Every structure is written in C-alpha cells, then in structure tokens.
Amino acid sequence: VKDSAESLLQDLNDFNAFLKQTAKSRTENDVHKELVKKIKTVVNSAEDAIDKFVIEAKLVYDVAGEIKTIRDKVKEIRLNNALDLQALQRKPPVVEEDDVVGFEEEADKVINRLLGGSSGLEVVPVVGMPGLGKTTLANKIYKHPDIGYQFFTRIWVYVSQSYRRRELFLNIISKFTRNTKQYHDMCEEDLADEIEDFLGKGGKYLIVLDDVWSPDAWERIRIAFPNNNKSNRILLTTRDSKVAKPHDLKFLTEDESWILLEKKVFHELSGKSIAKKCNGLPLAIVVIAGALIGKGKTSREWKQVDCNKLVQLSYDRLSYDLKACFLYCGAFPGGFEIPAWKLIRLWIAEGFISLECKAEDNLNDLINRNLVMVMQRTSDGQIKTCRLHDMLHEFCRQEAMKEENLFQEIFPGKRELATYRRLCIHSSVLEFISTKPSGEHVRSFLSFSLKKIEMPSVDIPTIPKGFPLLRVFDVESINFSRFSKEFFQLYHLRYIAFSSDTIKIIPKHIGELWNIQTLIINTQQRSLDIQANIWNMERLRHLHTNSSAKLPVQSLQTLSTIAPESCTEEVFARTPNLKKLGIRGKIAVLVKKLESLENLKLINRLPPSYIFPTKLRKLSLVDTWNDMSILGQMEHLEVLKLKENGFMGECWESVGGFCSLLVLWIERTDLVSWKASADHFPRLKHLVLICCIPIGLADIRSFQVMELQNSTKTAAISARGIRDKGFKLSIF
Amino acid sequence: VKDSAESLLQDLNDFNAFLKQTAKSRTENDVHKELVKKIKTVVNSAEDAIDKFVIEAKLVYDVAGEIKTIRDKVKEIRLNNALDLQALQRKPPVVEEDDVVGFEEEADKVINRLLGGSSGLEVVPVVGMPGLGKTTLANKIYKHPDIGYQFFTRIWVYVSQSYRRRELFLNIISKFTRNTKQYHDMCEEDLADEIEDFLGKGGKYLIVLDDVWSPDAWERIRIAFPNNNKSNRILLTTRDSKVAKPHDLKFLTEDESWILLEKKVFHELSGKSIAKKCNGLPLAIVVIAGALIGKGKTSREWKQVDCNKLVQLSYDRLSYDLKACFLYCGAFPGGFEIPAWKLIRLWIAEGFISLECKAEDNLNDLINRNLVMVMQRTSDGQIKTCRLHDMLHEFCRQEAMKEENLFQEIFPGKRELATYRRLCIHSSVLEFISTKPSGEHVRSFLSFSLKKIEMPSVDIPTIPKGFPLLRVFDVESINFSRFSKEFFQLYHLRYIAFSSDTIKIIPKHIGELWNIQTLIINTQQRSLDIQANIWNMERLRHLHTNSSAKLPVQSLQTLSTIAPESCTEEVFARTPNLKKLGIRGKIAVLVKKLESLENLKLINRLPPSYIFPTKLRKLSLVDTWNDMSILGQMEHLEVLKLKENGFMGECWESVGGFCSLLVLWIERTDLVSWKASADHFPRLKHLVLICCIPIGLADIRSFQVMELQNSTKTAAISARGIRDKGFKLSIF
Ligand SMILES: Nc1ncnc2c1ncn2[C@@H]1O[C@H](COP(=O)(O)OP(=O)(O)OP(=O)(O)O)[C@@H](O)[C@H]1O
C-alpha cells in the first residue's frame, strides 16, 4: 500500500503541475473546461486518499481500494484526453464625457494639485478600485477649461498591461509632426529624445498616463518627458498603489448613484434600491443601467432586478497562491468585517501559504492592488480588519463557486454534497444541520455569522459524523454545550475555532489530534482548564482563549490569556519561539526567558524594570501613576495601551524616558493632573485618550496624530491648542 | 449499476460539453456534420437510459443492458473519430436604388424627423426585422434631393458584426483628404479628432451608420462625430432594439408585395398568391423572384411554386440555451398566436431554462432582437401573446427538423419514429393516432390546433403506450373522455396539459407522478374535484384549471380557480411562495398569510380593507359601487380589472384614494353616473371601458392611454373632449 501511495503521490504531483500550468491562461473551450474540472476532482480525491493513508499509517483495506480506483481513474484520464492535455498547456476605454456625476469637486481638487507645486516635473497619481472612474476623472480634468488654458500642450497616453514603447513614442511624435517616416530607423531612445525636444520647445505640458500597471512601464515611458524647470505635470491613473509611490478616488454616494442610474436609464423605490446596491461603484451602475434599459418600464420587472472582464485584469495578475487567498476572502458573507488575524490563520490552515509573515505579505499585496479594502488598523499601523467590495465579493463568490469549486455556499442534495470541498453556511444553520448532511470530501466547515447560535444536544455530533475529513472547523458563532466522541475522531483537523457557554475543561482527547495548528476556545466562563497535551502537539502554533486557561504541567507562537499559575519556568521553557503572550488570571499572583516576545498583555506594584523582557515592543495592562517610571526604562517598548482602569491615580508627573514609545493609549482612567515635557516622549507619534493635557508635546517632532474622545471640554480646548501649535486631531 | 450510471453520466457530460463547443461555429464539412448527428443521438440515448435508471431507483436488467450498450457506443465513437473530434472544437450590402416600392412615405417621415429637431447631434434609429429593408430606406433617404440640399456633408459608414475602427476612421478620412499616408502613426483617437475637425469645418452633416449590432460599437464609433450645436444628424439601422435606445420600419402590403414581385420578375393569380405568402418581407419577395426568373412563364410552373445566411447572422449571436428556446417557437404552427405563459412553461419543462423570470427574460431577449413579434400585451405592459414571422418560422422549422432534431412535425415509419425526440402534430391527429405509433425516444407530444378534437375511446391509451418516456404532453386541443391505466405510468411527465368535457374528478394516481411541474386541466364541467396528492408533488409549480377545482385537505406558484372551500388556512400554509391565486367557487361563500401574492382573481359585500393582502398588485373581480372605497385603501394595488358584471350600481362617487393604481379596467357594467377628480387617481395611466366620464382625469400627469369600446355616443364625446384637453384614445 505504501508503494501505491508513492505512485499516487507522483500522479497527484503531475496533475497539480498541469493544473498550475493551465491556470496561466483562461480557456473558453468547453471541452477543456470540463477536462480541467475532471482533473481537479481527481486531484481532490487523490489528496483525500493520501491523507487517509497517512492518518492510518500514523495510527486500510478501504484505503487500498480507494487508492487503486483513483490510480485507475488517473490512468483513464491520461489515456483518453492526451490530445486535450497537450493542447491545454488594444482598445482604449470609452468613458462618459457629458453626464459625469459626483466628480465636480474631485476634479477641482486634482486640478488645484496640478496647477500648484514646485517648478519640477511632478506627478499626480490617481489610485482606485477597478471601475471606480479614474479614467473618467482624468478625462474630465484633461478637457477642463482651466487645464486647457494653463497647459499649452496636453497629451493623453493610454498605457496598459500590453504596450509597445516604439508605438507609444511614435504616437506622441505624431501630435507634433506629420512626417513620421523620418523616424523609421531611429532607436526608441532617439525617439524619446525627439519627444523631449518637442515638449521642451513649447511651454508647460500636461500628460495623462492612463492605466499604468507596473513601475517598470512608468520608468521606461518617463524617459521621453523633459524636466526643464517648468511646472510640467503628469496625471497618472492606476489600480496598484505601488505605482503611485497619491489621490484615492472617492466612491459615489447613494444620491449620486441614484442620479447616475436615472440619467443612464431615463435619458422609484425599486430604482433607488438598485442604485443603493451598487455601493457607489459607477461601473456597476452602468452595467445595471444597460441591463435595465432592455426591460420594460414596469414596477414588476424592476423588482425582479431587486463587469467581469475588467476585474479579471487584476485577478489574472495574481500568483497561483494569491488567487486562492483572494477567492477565500469571498467565503465571508457580504459586507462582513474580516478579522485579519483570523483570515491569516485560515489561509495557513487551508494550505494556501514564517508562515504568518508570508500571509500578511499576501494580505498587503491584495490591499495594494486595491482588491481588498482596509477599514480598521491597529494603533501601531498594522491592519486589523478588512472587507471585500460587493462587486469584488460577487466576483470571488462566482469564481470560487463555479470555476474552481474552492468553496460552496449553502439545500444541496446527497449527490451534490459528495462533490463539495468546503462549506460556508451563515443562514439557517440549524435547519441545514437537522437534515443530517454527509460530505465525504468536505475539508472545511465555515460559519461566519454575527448572531450567536445555540446548537441542540441531539444535533451535536452531526458535523464530525457527516464530515470526517474536516481540516478547518470555524463555528465560533455556534455554542457547543459538550463535545461528542466523534469530535476526537477528526484527526485531519488543523484549524478548530468553537464558542461555548459552559465548557470549563478541555478533554485530554483533544491531544489525540496532532494536526492542530490553531486552537481557539471562545468561552464565557471565567476560568478554563486545558487538560489536553498542548506540548505534545508538534504543529500547534496559536492558542487563543478569552478565559484564564490553565496549561498542563517550538512551533508555538501565541499563548493568549493563560493563568499566571501556568507562567512557570518549566512551561515557558517549552515555548522558546513565543511572540505574543497574554495573562488574565488575577495578575496579583505574579517571562524573562522569552527572548523573542513582542506582545505582552496582563488583565486583572510593578517589579523592577530589569525583570520585564528587554525585547518587548507592545505591552497592554488592563484592570491592573508613578509606576510608569518602570515602563519608561523599557528601551524597546513602542506601544503602551492602558485600558479599563489600567493605571489609577490622581497626579502623574512624567519622569521616565520613553526613548522608543510611539503610541500611548489610555482608556477609562481617573487621571486628573498630568505634567510632561518633550524630553520624556522623544518619539511619540500616536496619542489616544478615551473616557479618561500638558503643552509640552507640541515640541515633539514625530507627534503627528492625536485622538480624543468624550471627556471634559478643558481637554478638548487643550487638544485644539496643541493642534494650533500634518497634525491629525479628532475630538468626540 | 449505480457506478455504471455515474460513468455514463460522466460520458454524457463530456459529450454535452463537446456539443456546446461545436455549436459556437457552423461547419460545412459533411463528415463533421454526420459525427455531430451521431454524437447527438448517443447523447439522447444516454439521457433516456439515465432517466429510466433514476425512475427505477426512485421506485433494471434491461436498463443495465442499455447502459452497457450506450457506454460501448460512447467508447467506440471516442476511439474511431478522435481526429474529427479534435478538429471539431467584408461585403457591404447591395440594395435596390431604382425600383423601391412602399417606402415613399416612410422616407418622408424619416426625412422630416432628420430635418426637424434641436440643434444638438440627434440620432434617428431604424429598427426592423432581418431583411425588412432598413438599408434600402437608409439609401433612399441618403440620396434624397431634400437631404442632399439640406446636408452639406453626407457620409455612409457600413458597420457590421466584424469591423475595424482604424479602417473605418481611415475610410472616413479619405472622403476629405487624399494624403492619408500622414496618418500611418497616429492613434485611433487622433484619427477621431481629425475626423471631428473635418466634420466641424463645414456645415451640417448626415452620417448613416448601417448595421450596428451592439451599443459598444456605437459608443466606440461615436467619438469621431462632433456636436458643435449644429443640426447634425445620424441615421442608424439595426436589428436589435437595445442599440436604438426609434423608427420601426413598416412591412409591405399585399398590393405592394405583388408590385415588387411583378417588377422583379417582369422588368396572375399564381403570382398574387406567391407575393401574398411572403408576408410583406421584401427579402422573401426578392428571393422568390430570383427563383421565378429561372422558370418558364407557364402557369403550371408557377403553380408548382405555390435568405438563410441573413437570418443566421442574428441566430448565431444567440446563446446556447436561447437558440433552443428560439427554435422551440417553430413548433407552433404557422401564424399561430403563441401564448406567452404557455411558451414559458413549455420552455421550463423542456429543460431549456426564478425559472419564470429567466424564461421571460429569454422571451424579451428574442423580442428585442426582432426575432419574435409581439401582438397582444397585458394591460400592465407585460407580453400576452406572440408569433414568429413566416420566414423565421420556416428557418426555425428547417433548422430544428434537419440540423438539430429538436422536434419533428408530422406518416413516419417505425424506423424513422425511433429517432424522433419531439412530435408536433396539428393536422390529421386521429389518422396518425389510429396507426398506433411507437416512439421509444420521444420526449414531447405537442398538438397546437385551434379546432377541438374528440379522442376515440379505443384510441385513448395509444399515446402513453407508444411514448412511455413523455416529459411534455400538450394535447389541450384533444378531449379525453377518461384516463387509462397507461397514463399513470408516465413517470417522466413534467408538463401535462389536457382538455376534457366530462372529467369531474382527478384520480389519486396522478400523485404517483412526482415529476409534474405544470398541471393544466381545461374541463368544461362547472366543478372539479382534485383527489390527487397535490402537496406531495415536490416539483409542482403551476396548477391551471378553468373550473372550481377542490384541492385535497414550497415550489407552488399558481393556484388558478380553486374553490373557496379549499381556501382554508391549512391549504394556504402549504404554499408560502404562491404569487397568483384565483377563485371561481361562488365567492359568496368567502389569503392573508400569502405574503408574496401579487395576482388575485375572484369569479362568482367586500370585507374591511385590512383583510385583503397588503402586497397585492393586481386584483380582478368577475361576476361579484360605493364598495370601491375598500379597494382604494390598497396602497400597492396597481391593476384593477372589473369584468362581466364585476361592479354593479347606478351612482358611483369617487371617495377612496388609489395612490398606486395605474390601470383601471371596467367591463359589462350598468354604471350610469360616475364622478371623480384627479386626486383620487394620482397615478392613473390606463383606462379601459368595454360594453359599459367625469372631466377630472385630464389633470392627471400620468394619464396617457385611454381605451373605449361600444357604448353611447355621450361617452365618446366625453373621451374626445378629454383627448382635446402623447395621449392615446381609441373609440369603437
Ligand atoms: N462619475 C461618473 N459619472 C458617470 N459615469 C461614470 C462615472 N465614473 C465612471 N463612469 C462610467 O463607468 C465606467 C467606469 O470606467 P472608468 O474607465 O471610468 O473606470 P476606471 O477607474 O478607469 O477603471 P479601470 O481600472 O477598469 O480602468 C465607464 O463606463 C465610465 O464612463
């Protein structure tokens, strides 16, 4: 059976290489698409069989039969479709010029940015979502009367993914001379020099480089534009934020969306609801208006209404792994606030992806390409939450549900569920669960709902029974009263995330699951006792709990909210690579050996400063004023968060030197008198005071962002005075 | 056998994908055509075998043998014709300039539309049927003396499905300059700008954009035409109505058709009959005249007479499913008024295609492309009936009967009937039935005849016997005295539509057919008792009866003319998705729980307005005046039809406020005095009074269509006065 496993592994590797090769091009051939789907199904079957054999080897007849039948299927596919297997390995946009809604103020903003500045060649980059309207705004600015009056020469160059520098340079030359047959033998650099002479002969010039996709194209084309100490400007529209390094183009409002839809259809509650569902994207409004123009003007045909090639331009530029990472963001429901940490852990568990660094790099790559929107950011600048735009969400859902079978949103029949690979259900979870589903190839069970669900006791073991091959089990919105004997049979589990109301103890049978990477226990009990062999899990990396978990007496990276009785030297000696640590166990009971620790959280007198780790970067104290001199000696502390009565006192005088502090966060304190000088916070950048101000922080060079919340008006006056003395101040 | 069924399903899926791929291109290779026919036959055989196995599993040796032989045939086809399987995956029109008949008034109409209007660039779109004569009319206008005198510049641009913008722009440029070698390096946008200056140098210009097929081409080409506040005009001819959003070109009359045929043949009763059969299409007249010019001028050779590539241009632009939907319209006999609801239900049952929304979208797509003609429209603007033009009817019949075998019109022998898939017989039904036909692969039995046929008792079970695989059974023109035991063996039935004269009860064995989607019972009895398990039919959606059906004590959408004794809470609790409901059961005997209901029909004192459903959009009362104040409180009612003594009274004073009403229909009433004001009908648009007028409706902004019928001349005078005070009034 082992040699059969090796042969099946070789077949699966060749099929995976074929799938990776065919993903480089989109095929419209239906036979090729069907063959690709068949090959993907066989690949999934082979993966499941190999994982089953691996689990049995770690711990057989049915496994052998499955391996034989999958090998036979592979041979049949190779023999039958050999020829198909071998065969499977410029229009500038027309934008609106007459009825442009909402861009009247953004156009003036960009124009005033173009008409003002230094005397050098400056660039005004416009970045935005696919179909946001960057070309429309660039055209409105390009044909504006003020721009035409100020700029003697205006040139519109349409760059794209595919362009020829010689063709572009000869197109630019034709705007100045008609005898372009004299350049048939000059090189592209001589063409650029000729363009430089042409542009320098006149006055100021404005150049619109539309749809720049890489900095390489920008550098190659820029050699034709002189910098002759005149206020020459370049207007650049791009999807990627890297090419702009800007002006982030706005979204249309609800009223503007309705205005655009009404103008496009008619040169109504149903119409207003249709325009509201486009989320301020003019491309969606245009597409839906083109669809509505063909239907009759009847309220019943507009209630039935309640593109794809433009998005594919940026989706086809993603790598093979980044495409699967991007499509997995469509599993989260529409408008959902995706937690970045949860998304990263899910990506690592699904096998798409230190691994955390690569996953954060993938998320930042998706954000830079404007495929993912950021809303919440951490105080230190990291991303906290994100979401997909509704058109991007629809694209991801359609692609991953139809063409890739990455996941299926849920009722499917017994024949349909046998082909599903991942399940995402957030509505009518109990109704689907009561049907007793059974999927032998389902690898993930996702349930992202913000409403808590209590799982009936009679239905407790249905998911571990019907889906025994689960690798990801994210049911943190479902309360599990108890664990059945079938949960411990999920030997393939890598990501487990459950919520509970009465689970005060983790059984030792959890340690029988040696594939666990992330163990998230969201319980409302005050204390939790983890009896499972945490240290015997060789693949465990993160352990998140919201209670005071008590660990039993290398790859581990996070130990969130453990009890201080579990802060022994023996326990900390088993986790040399720990980076984030939290304690929520009556701090008064009590980490030096953790030389890689960066995040520390204590939730409820400070010891000498030499006891705390010297490499700590972020420290947060919750429910625990002159004691801050101990935290001042921390030479590497950069973020300090005080939440929920973290530091209580009346008078605080700044004495210690926070040589590395960048963010100071104080929440729910009784501080009355605070005296400080610029010397005590040399590197301060971020200051947040919520539900709580010496004028010495205006002398700080790095102080640029200050956040204020509800408090006495004297604090608001002090903040306003500090702002008067770019600074960002917000008071609420 | 189950695994054999899965393997056959995989083979059928691959063959279906191949058939979908080859449908994208028309092949003239006879070997390829024969191979495609063979593959289609094998696909049909596999489908029948799989459905037989599914029925048997729901409820065997012969099924296994058939599956074996079909799989062997699939392997043989794959092995023998592998190379053939792998291989299977600009002329502007010349139109008549001398002898153009019938267009003398249409040309003047379009010219007066061109010569009059605003000072902006306006478009006069000419939409029409394939071969209607749009290009001929455009050429007649283009060369008209008045057009030539008024327009200094006239340009004829021939757009088509395949065009190059650079080539078109260089062709337009050549009309102004002969040195076109100076534009060899300018981009298409610079070419459009050059054309803009060329057109703006002179005066008014007329441009004829012939054969525009998509709005994208219109938008791409329009960038070359300036709008310089001169009365510049664009004449556009297209087949699709979407590109015009017009001028619907007329059809030639019978006399004009005969004139054209006589002019074309001779530079007769048989000639007049030939010209009459062209249905006013000049293309058909031209083709038949070219055919007749070769024959001798003998009355016997003209009585023997009693194109295709032009229609294929619009047929090849249809999707794969829309092609089958279009060809199915050719099943209905020539000149037949196809009921839209019946067509949609037939499309859903045949598997071509909520499903009703998609089917209505398909019908509207066919109509917009001018492939289907609309005659009868519902009072609210929906389509009621339609038909195919005789040339499209012939095209659909020929294509679906020869190249696709979609259906066969009927006598065929036992060998020929074994290959037929669908049967359409409307003439000599009894003669064909008496022959005892037997088709093992026939899936549909269509009989669309307007003359009623009584079915002999001895011939009752012949159709369920000879055609046991029936999925669609549309014999609503045939009266069935009783149901034989073979009818209940039609387990594959999805669409059953029969007419009867003495069937007063539906047997419980109908519920044994669980595949039924539409159940139409057209009986002449006053009352009907449905004993079949309607609620056990999980796939049933529509139930249309013309009698007072008595239902027995989710997918259901229509319950037409049920008895009010069947309007219980229990019955209405089983149909939460019902949208259309009718009752014809002595209304005096008696729906709130139906929160999705839109259509309500009561056929024979109103209860308080809070009892009726709040989401009702259309309500019709038949045989049931101050009580209309109850209907006025309906905030969402838009269509109100009163037919056959619906509202009887002498004096009616408008009190209630119809805030949402758009159509008011009153038929066969004794109303004498009617007083109303504009406030009581704020949104009224349509008013119909048949076989039955305050001047307060002229103040209604939305009142644009009023229909009148036979009545006293005082009503006609009132209607004429209202019209005097665009409004559409018709009095008969
Ligand atoms: N403010 C607006 N008013 C009217 N139409 C608009 C507006 N913004 C965009 N559109 C229209 O919606 C579509 C958006 O395409 P556009 O070229 O403006 O987007 P883009 O930002 O350049 O996107 P892409 O990255 O795909 O090039 C076009 O058809 C454009 O005419």
Ligand SMILES: Nc1ncnc2c1ncn2[C@@H]1O[C@H](COP(=O)(O)OP(=O)(O)OP(=O)(O)O)[C@@H](O)[C@H]1O
């Ligand atoms: N009124 C007419 N009198 C004489 N011949 C006509 C008339 N109308 C059309 N024809 C002729 O019949 C044929 C119809 O083709 P025509 O180009 O006029 O149609 P069309 O509306 O442009 O169709 P298509 O959509 O296929 O382009 C041509 O041969 C044309 O010369």
